[PDB]
């Protein structure tokens, strides 16, 4: 059948990816016991936009529900599923002549048909007949809320929906669940997005050079994901955090936008990951910036190595996922003290949630259509109302086919550092003496990503994170040399 | 005084560019028999947003109207200007500790205030008691209707606004009319995103290889700008049409998404401009893929740049902008009568409307923070119902200040071809024996920006648009 496909080298996907989709959808849905006889699914596809009230139009990315069940990237468009015989019907939006002069070739319904293997397509302004005809018992169309943004999924409307019996509360949970585990289609389209992704780190890591602006990588890393991967889209803002801007967890948006010289001396703290096909990557590179780990820098490296190794060894099916976010705390305390910034029992710095001033941040989230990707806080999943932890984006158990990003960080963050300070709790684990060498150092991530299979993980990233690696491709050594 | 920069080799851009905005605008007001002394313009910034339901930020870019009056780059904030006084209050938002963790530092008032020379600063939460602190008459907000988008401009709001006199007519004409006369130091960036941008084109035609996919090339273009100019954004989508697709105006869209192979004997159409703190570029270059125009190929495109060189050569104060759109297709009809593609009398070739048969968009536009720049329509003037001419952006006369694309092209879209030959007053000036050597050629623009002066024009763009130039280029000569 029919693939999505930018030429060149990049990843041919097959369209039975989003059939299969389908199909797991409708199985879900059919062992539902509330779902009734002759339901459909109707899903509404992302509109095109413009920047605020001019005619400047926005690229068009599409709604990722959508796209996890269609593959469709032209906006206007609608998507029904029948549950009980799976049939699918795409509606398209019937285009004016005009069209063909300005925006391209107005394609037939046939066209559409064959291209997303669908098994039938209309136009939009049909919908309201063509579903009167199908004579279904109910509409189910997709609400709820996004445990990241807060935000309400909006559902699907056209004018005549108000004709049909629509339910609003099955849908939404059943396609997260979906979403949350990977089909063996999807988990080739992941390994490629962490594919391109690793190279452009690798030619970031390559590139930088004291002097150079932060931005001056971001653009270099989505020139490579797009010339040589097809990923005309990131997956999220690169993050381009240099000497203390790599203490800023969500650094380079508008209001800090990757706008600072690179220094001799600093750490950089790259986390970037280009989107392929709606498909995201989350990859994370911590180095110096001028080639060469001091002693302090090296420390502080080797302590996030050590606990990205023991969470992504004791990673399999089972696994309570805030159980690995404290053991990657413990291991950072205890490595910390190995330094000499803390000392005391680290028994008793857990229990004064210490880890959390130095890794604000959760462990790591799935990841999927979306960088932060649903469905880690299904109903009955409670967020851990804790330092550092109340940040995990799931509370879940590890099960095969998650795709889960692990991304352990240690920080040196002022004004954490001055609470714990403060108080009579934590201050006394803290040695300012030493400590005080390493104000203003930023933080080290280490961030890959990993599908958990049946017995243990998958690694789907593969880029220079160990100290000699690093060194190594900094020095231009070929990617195969083994330091 | 302070300025916008991004390091390297990029632009200082004064902030001193967005005082001079606002008290032209204020001048503006002052004149404007309806408004009434005591009031005070509330201008609304954009706010952050994210893509659908999810938590995936959008990378924010500034409302054109705020940024023209302000030049603020943060998300979330408010400006207020004292139309008697000039005063100008911006408001910020008040942030909350984890934002030291999440995003950056937590800037003082002082920061932003000495950062964009305003007045004063305050935040968000107090701009109604600020506001009511001023006793003004009305707020003036913003509301109108774009004439490229048909859209409204949504004006500001506040939770307390009702408690106020609010107008939100008489703003919007006065504050377009400002933009469509750009300063001295707006020109100053809009020479830079041209030099910047202009320099991209040439690194794209350096770089142009058969074989490769057209979105290479928007890449390596949006590299350039970005890491060399320090564009984060582009001005619109990259328009990269080989082959057929350089016959479609704005192809490069999601539908459409630059994702051919590029062809041996293609030609290419690259419309692409970067952005540079919101201010726009536009420049379009056509050549043939494999670096030699054919014969057939260099004909259509000196038509195209007869037609650019006339225009550009016309163009100084008080001209009729339709006028110039005439002039273009006259010139296309002459030469493609020339060629073999048309016969008979140019003067009823002209009357039947036949040039926006191989012209159907508008010659030009004004371009400033937006590509499609605000106030080609202002009310009184009136958009002219005609093939090609309809599509024309602004129906104004040019006067010095003015910032206009100038962009003929000749295409062969097949309805549009087909449309005149089943029509018997234009089937008659077709010779489909030629014209069918040109089905699938696609077609050629060539695009200029150029500031209209006192005398004449200053031209902005610095490409390679003869043939020999051309030709020169992509040889790596
Ligand atoms: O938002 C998150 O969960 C991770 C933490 C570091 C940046 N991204
Ligand atoms: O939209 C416009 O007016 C011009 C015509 C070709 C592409 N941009
Ligand atoms: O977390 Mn990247
Ligand atoms: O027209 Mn660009
Ligand atoms: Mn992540
Ligand atoms: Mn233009």
Request: proline share 4%; with cysteine; aromatic share 8%.
């Amino acid at each position: 059948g029919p693939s999505f496909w930018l030429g060149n080298e990049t990843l041919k996907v097959p369209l039975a990816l989003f059939a299969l989709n389908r199909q797991r959808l409708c199985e879900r849905l059919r062992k539902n016991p509330a779902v009734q006889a002759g339901s459909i699914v109707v899903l509404q596809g992302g509109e095109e936009t413009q920047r605020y009230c001019t005619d400047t139009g926005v690229l068009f990315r599409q709604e990722s529900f959508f796209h996890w069940a269609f593959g469709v990237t032209e906006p206007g468009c609608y998507g029904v599923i029948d549950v009980d015989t799976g049939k699918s019907t795409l509606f398209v939006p019937r285009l004016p002549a005009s069209h063909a002069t300005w925006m391209g070739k107005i394609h037939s319904k046939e066209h559409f048909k064959e291209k997303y293997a669908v098994d039938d397509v209309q136009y939009v302004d049909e919908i309201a007949s063509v579903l009167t005809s199908q004579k279904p018992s109910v509409l189910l169309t997709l609400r709820g809320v996004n445990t990241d943004s807060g935000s309400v999924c909006r559902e699907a409307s056209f004018d005549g929906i108000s004709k049909f019996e629509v339910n609003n509360t099955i849908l939404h949970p059943e396609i997260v669940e979906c979403r949350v585990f990977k089909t063996d289609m999807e988990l080739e389209v992941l390994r490629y997005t962490n594919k391109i992704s690793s190279e452009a780190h690798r030619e970031v890591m390559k590139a930088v050079k004291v002097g150079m602006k932060e931005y001056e990588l971001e653009s270099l890393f989505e020139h490579y994901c797009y010339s040589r991967g097809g990923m005309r889209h990131s997956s999220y803002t690169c993050i381009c955090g240099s000497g203390e801007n790599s203490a800023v967890l969500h650094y380079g948006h508008a209001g800090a936008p990757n706008d600072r010289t690179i220094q001799n001396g600093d750490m950089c703290l790259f986390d970037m990951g280009g989107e392929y096909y709606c498909f995201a990557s989350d990859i994370t590179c911590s180095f110096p910036a001028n080639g060469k780990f001091t002693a302090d820098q090296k420390a502080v490296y080797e302590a996030v190595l050590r606990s990205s190794r023991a969470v992504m060894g004791a990673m399999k099916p089972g696994v309570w996922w805030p159980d690995m976010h404290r053991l990657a705390d413990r291991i950072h305390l205890e490595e910390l003290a190995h330094m000499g910034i803390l000392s005391g029992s680290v028994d008793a710095m857990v229990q004064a949630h210490l880890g959390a001033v130095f890794m604000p941040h959760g462990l790591g989230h799935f990841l999927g259509i979306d960088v932060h990707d649903v469905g880690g806080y299904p109903e009955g999943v409670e967020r851990i109302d804790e330092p550092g932890l109340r940040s995990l984006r799931t509370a879940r158990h590890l099960q095969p086919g998650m795709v889960l990003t692990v991304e352990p960080g240690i920080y040196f963050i002022d004004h954490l550092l001055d609470e714990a300070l403060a108080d009579p709790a934590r201050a006394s684990f803290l040695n300012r003496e030493v400590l005080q060498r390493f104000r203003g150092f930023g933080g080290v991530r280490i961030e890959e990503d990993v599908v958990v299979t049946d017995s243990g993980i998958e690694l789907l990233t593969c880029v220079p994170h160990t100290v000699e690696e690093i060194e190594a491709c900094m020095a231009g050594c070929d990617k195969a040399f083994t330091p």
